[PDB]
Amino acid sequence: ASQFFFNQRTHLVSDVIDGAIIASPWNNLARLESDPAIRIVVRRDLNKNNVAVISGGGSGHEPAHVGFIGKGMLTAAVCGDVFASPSVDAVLTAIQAVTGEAGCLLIVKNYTGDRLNFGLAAEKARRLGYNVEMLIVGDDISLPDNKHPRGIAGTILVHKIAGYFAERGYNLATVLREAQYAASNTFSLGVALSSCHLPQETDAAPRHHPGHAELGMGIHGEPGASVIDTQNSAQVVNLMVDKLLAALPETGRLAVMINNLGGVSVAEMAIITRELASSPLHSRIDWLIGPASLVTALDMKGFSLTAIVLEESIEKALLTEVETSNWPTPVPPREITCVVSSHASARVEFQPSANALVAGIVELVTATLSDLETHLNALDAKVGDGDTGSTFAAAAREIASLLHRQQLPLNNLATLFALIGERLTVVMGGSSGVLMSIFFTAAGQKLEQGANVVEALNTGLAQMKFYGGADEGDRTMIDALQPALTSLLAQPKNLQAAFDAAQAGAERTCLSSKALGNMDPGAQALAMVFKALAESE
Amino acid sequence: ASQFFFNQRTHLVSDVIDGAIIASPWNNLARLESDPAIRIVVRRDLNKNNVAVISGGGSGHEPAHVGFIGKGMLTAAVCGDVFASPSVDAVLTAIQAVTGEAGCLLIVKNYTGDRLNFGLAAEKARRLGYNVEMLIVGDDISLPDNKHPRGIAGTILVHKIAGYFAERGYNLATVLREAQYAASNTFSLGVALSSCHLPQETDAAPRHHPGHAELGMGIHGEPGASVIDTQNSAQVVNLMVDKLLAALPETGRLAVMINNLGGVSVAEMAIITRELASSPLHSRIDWLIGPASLVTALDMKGFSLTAIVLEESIEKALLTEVETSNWPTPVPPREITCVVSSHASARVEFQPSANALVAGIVELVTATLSDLETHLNALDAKVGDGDTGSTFAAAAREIASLLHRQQLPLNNLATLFALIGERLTVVMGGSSGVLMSIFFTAAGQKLEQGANVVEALNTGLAQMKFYGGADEGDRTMIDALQPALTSLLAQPKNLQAAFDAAQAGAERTCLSSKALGNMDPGAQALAMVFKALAESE
Numbered sequence A, B: 001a002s003q004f005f006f007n008q009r010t011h012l013v014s015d016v017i018d019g020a021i022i023a024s025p026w027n028n029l030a031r032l033e034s035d036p037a038i039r040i041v042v043r044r045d046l047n048k049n050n051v052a053v054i055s056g057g058g059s060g061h062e063p064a065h066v067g068f069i070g071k072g073m074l075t076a077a078v079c080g081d082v083f084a085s086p087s088v089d090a091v092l093t094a095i096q097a098v099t100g101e102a103g104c105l106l107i108v109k110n111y112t113g114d115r116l117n118f119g120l121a122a123e124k125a126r127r128l129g130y131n132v133e134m135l136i137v138g139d140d141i142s143l144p145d146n147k148h149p150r151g152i153a154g155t156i157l158v159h160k161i162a163g164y165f166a167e168r169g170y171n172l173a174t175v176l177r178e179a180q181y182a183a184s185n186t187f188s189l190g191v192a193l194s195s196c197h198l199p200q201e202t203d204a205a206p207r208h209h210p211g212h213a214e215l216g217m218g219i220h221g222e223p224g225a226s227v228i229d230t231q232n233s234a235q236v237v238n239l240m241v242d243k244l245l246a247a248l249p250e251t252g253r254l255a256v257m258i259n260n261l262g263g264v265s266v267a268e269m270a271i272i273t274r275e276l277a278s279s280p281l282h283s284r285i286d287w288l289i290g291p292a293s294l295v296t297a298l299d300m301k302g303f304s305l306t307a308i309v310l311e312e313s314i315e316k317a318l319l320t321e322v323e324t325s326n327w328p329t330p331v332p333p334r335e336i337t338c339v340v341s342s343h344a345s346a347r348v349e350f351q352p353s354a355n356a357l358v359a360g361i362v363e364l365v366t367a368t369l370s371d372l373e374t375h376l377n378a379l380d381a382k383v384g385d386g387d388t389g390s391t392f393a394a395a396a397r398e399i400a401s402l403l404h405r406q407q408l409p410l411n412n413l414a415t416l417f418a419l420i421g422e423r424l425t426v427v428m429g430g431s432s433g434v435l436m437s438i439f440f441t442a443a444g445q446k447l448e449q450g451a452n453v454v455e456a457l458n459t460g461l462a463q464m465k466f467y468g469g470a471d472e473g474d475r476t477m478i479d480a481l482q483p484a485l486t487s488l489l490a491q492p493k494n495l496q497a498a499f500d501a502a503q504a505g506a507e508r509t510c511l512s513s514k515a516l517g518n519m520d521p522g523a524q525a526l527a528m529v530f531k532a533l534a535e536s537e
């Protein structure tokens, strides 16, 4: 057991190169022909004139590094198995394959493996006349007590710079110089809630600290430095900023790169951006690079923060656009702005009126429902959350009240409907309330545009179905309403006819239980209403 | 206990809007002033003239939908809490705030919540004169037995189209029409290894099926349809393709969108792309949209596949560039190509020679090490993996052999070194081998460029330090080599002097254990070598 989408373990690395290629925005990536145990990617527009910038490292960091290959950055990338440096054979095959006479600059992440392998390589290469140069990058500041700073997220910035001068046609020695400069002005710090899943069956889940967060967890999954007693975005980001400010000049503009280690939600990544924005670090940030997954660790739920000082040339090269696959384009921290609108109140206006007829109905209808409360709750109990009767009564009691306080526009229906619509949702929560609002609301806009009572009701229904998604036969109040309304559309004055129609429909809902004790509360509610009307006309 | 980067639970949604804004590439996003319980984002370049396309839904799907706001797509986006539709109050405030006279088209994801809320809204809006229109999107094909297809990943394509016609200045009724057209030509299917983590303490971990994968897992984390008996990339992707082909025309070009639900590694996402590339679906794909996180479910470890038929207008509108935050730019499935190089073999050339002197050393040195094997293994056992003696002997026995078979270029050192360098890594695996290769290899390139034996050795060392990262005092063989080499650089012929130097250094490594039983194998190995040399001169 594990949790990894992959086919043939042994074709893992390869398959990733393929898919990386099959998605090249600039179709500028190409695999270098060679033994299967050597996985190299090289830019199709090879310019052996300029100094070639080669980079690499293990897999699982993705897009690093095939991602940053092409005009403006990496010439080629050497990929080894998951979390393991390539062979010497491969780093060499790469130098030869793409290095011209201007030379090549190997940019290696600070780890004894990559160093040793890329190193022996660079040597066997020097010996073949190739002018080689190697720059070890160590930007992690998470373990100051350790001799060799781990190389992480910041590495790619070192590329951006090196690549700049490379394309401009500068001498190898000038590339290296400018490359190291950036490096020594780069500081990265990472945090993670839980490690990453691997492409193999393992003992137990990934390292994890319940409720806590590990600071400085290595991209290979290495153990970090400390453990923060919380998972709180603000707190955690601030702490990181301190440790970051603690190792950055007391003054100097800078660009900050927010890296997603692979398993943080886009949402979370966003909060973290808001956190760093309100960070004591804000007042010196002229640029943001992220949120984005730039140098990940498989699906590790962690993010990183990389700061780079803008002294001299650095900034110029950052901002220069390039032709890579995943390189993000620096963006100055925008300022949240509040746009305003001429927002007209919806609160329906009305002027109280009396109307012996309509009032008699509003009274009868409202009252009818109000008594059922208990029984409808009973029915809703064998079916759902036993809240129907109470829910429906709230809406009734409310309009019933407004009736008695003489505050109802009885003389104008299109307005009375619109009013009821705009009030039920309040007294009654839940879908019902909204559905019962959609009904009248849509109804009143049919009456308004000059239509009879039955045509509005029927349309108020059509809308209730459109949004509510319910048809006849779904064991719903629609099962009694429609029939009832379809009967009034024929014989507009025959209330017995419409009553019977509802009662029949209300009964169908009784013939498909999975819990007359299986009856759908809505249907009943409806039917008993039309029954009330009929026993008075 | 949980696993979520967030500060104030109640400011969750808001905070995400902020960070989404603070990163706007086009600085075209702005929050609409309103009560705090109403979270709306609207494009700054509001053009009431064109029909406004409003969309929304819960949070946690991220960049959807604030990410797709701007020229060419969404006018505004209404955001509700995590995995919960916005209020009616909010969907309305949005329509008013940005809808002109040309009207507005609400594009809603198929879920009873969003429908009901955005619906009552659209109604209360119609009533205020606003020409409103609502399009429910349902592209999930994972549960054909269900009445209402869930809305997912494909939704954004529906936007791309609707937005197209909107900006061109078309009539509301033309937008809707073209919008629905795309929708009905969109088919999505998702898979997940495990659900997502939420911003709250919960009973147990997210749904998960050890070794298996859930098909049709809802973006809210709903239960999917089936469960595949494997996690295999190829298998899983193929199955999805079948079910996809099963619901797509037997003929027709199409674009496919590969969506990352939030928690899949970039690497995995890439394999899945390679899988779909070799899929029975390839021969009809003129475009790829992804891999990318477009409509996620927090950190859910799953991906989705959305197919859209290119009949008529659809394709024209897809490809049109827009001014959004996260909209990807369709890219035709590239073809992996193999670039070739003029790769010169490194295999060092040499012509056998005899040399009484040098051979006497190669013999003495090689032999000296060869005997230690046992003792060096003992020392390496109290310190590391008890493999030193054996490792070092392999390298010795090997050169010792080559000595005896008269196959060594004894007459030319620069070549003998270069040869030994190019052979030790083979007989001896592990860092030692590589270090011992870096030594001689770099050495031979110093002798080659005309230098004495001691200057090469000293340089071979300098390199070993540069790549190996070890300095004097790190309890390493460097602790005996350097002193020894530093002694020969002064008195080049005094072997006793150099011996003593090593023996002293070898002894320092003895004064900092954490396991003369604490001695570093490397150091000893070295010292006993210079001792051998001295007891013969």
Ligand SMILES: Nc1ncnc2c1ncn2[C@@H]1O[C@H](COP(=O)(O)OP(=O)(O)NP(=O)(O)O)[C@@H](O)[C@H]1O
Residues within 6 Å of the ligand: A380, A384, A385, A387, A388, A389, A391, A392, A429, A430, A431, A432, A433, A435, A464, A465, A467, A468, A469, A470, A475, A476, A477, A478, A520, A521, A522, A523
């Ligand atoms: N399209 C529809 N979808 C769902 N329910 C409907 C629909 N049309 C009518 N109903 C009725 O809605 C009633 C539900 O009762 P109600 O008093 O709202 O409690 P509830 O809906 O079960 N809980 P809640 O989701 O919080 O509103 C049922 O009796 C159904 O008859």
Ligand SMILES: Nc1ncnc2c1ncn2[C@@H]1O[C@H](COP(=O)(O)OP(=O)(O)NP(=O)(O)O)[C@@H](O)[C@H]1O
Residues within 6 Å of the ligand: B380, B384, B385, B386, B387, B388, B389, B391, B392, B429, B430, B431, B432, B433, B435, B464, B465, B467, B468, B469, B470, B475, B476, B477, B478, B520, B521, B522, B523
């Ligand atoms: N960076 C370094 N530079 C120089 N010498 C080193 C360095 N690291 C280790 N050594 C020496 O190399 C010896 C390593 O012994 P060895 O028998 O190769 O076991 P090992 O280090 O565990 N090989 P491996 O299993 O690949 O890690 C030690 O005695 C050290 O003296």
Ligand SMILES: O=C(CO)CO
Residues within 6 Å of the ligand: A056, A057, A058, A059, A061, A082, A083, A084, A085, A109, A111, A113, A114, A220
């Ligand atoms: O993945 C790690 C292996 O060394 C860094 O490349």
Ligand SMILES: O=C(CO)CO
Residues within 6 Å of the ligand: B056, B057, B058, B059, B061, B082, B083, B084, B085, B109, B111, B113, B114, B219, B220
């Ligand atoms: O998050 C979901 C809420 O219904 C989809 O918008």
Ligand SMILES: [Mg+2]
Residues within 6 Å of the ligand: A380, A384, A385, A386, A387, A388
């Ligand atoms: Mg109920």
Ligand SMILES: [Mg+2]
Residues within 6 Å of the ligand: A385, A387, A430
């Ligand atoms: Mg309820």
Ligand SMILES: [Mg+2]
Residues within 6 Å of the ligand: B380, B384, B385, B386, B387, B388
């Ligand atoms: Mg050992």
Ligand SMILES: [Mg+2]
Residues within 6 Å of the ligand: B385, B387, B429, B430, B431
């Ligand atoms: Mg070993």
